[PDB]
Structures are given as structure tokens and as C-alpha cells.
Amino acid sequence: SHGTRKGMLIECDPAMKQFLLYLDESNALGKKFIIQDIDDTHVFVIAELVNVLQERVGELMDQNAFSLTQK
């Protein structure tokens, strides 16, 4: 084998799939997560997609007095 990449293959309806493509193109999560587009219902993404999403949602929380000294 020449090219190989560890990751996560996702299978989902045509709607959700287009949404992932939209999220990836717009960097709505702060960073790209799509390694390769495949089918209209399949996409190969980074293994740590959940962490990325968990990290993005954190910034969405309400700002407080410690928002800048801790983050």
C-alpha cells in the first residue's frame, strides 16, 4: 500500500452529509475535519471529530470573569 490514513468513515442520509460538508467548508468547528469525500451518504473524517466538536461547543458557552485568564 502507498497511501493510508487512520480515521472514521461515516454513513448518513444525504441531508446530514451535506451538512457535514457545509460545516467543514465554513470551518464552523474552528478546523477542517473532512479527510475525503466519498459518496452522497459517506464521508471519511478525522478520528478525533468528537473532541473537535466538544472543543467548539465550549467556546459557545457564556462568557464569565475567568474567560480570558483561563482560556
Please tell me the experimental approach by which this structure was elucidated.
X-ray
| Torsion-angle region of 62 (φ positive above 0: left; ψ -120 to 50: alpha; else: beta) | beta
Give resolution, Å, one decimal: 2.3
What is the distance between the alpha carbons of residues 63 and 7, in angstroms, rounded to a whole number? 33
> What structural domains and CATH numbers belong to the chain?
1-71 (3.30.70.1220)
CB count in 10 Å sphere of residue 35:
16
Residue with cell 482560556: 71
Contact 65, 39 (CB under 8 A): no
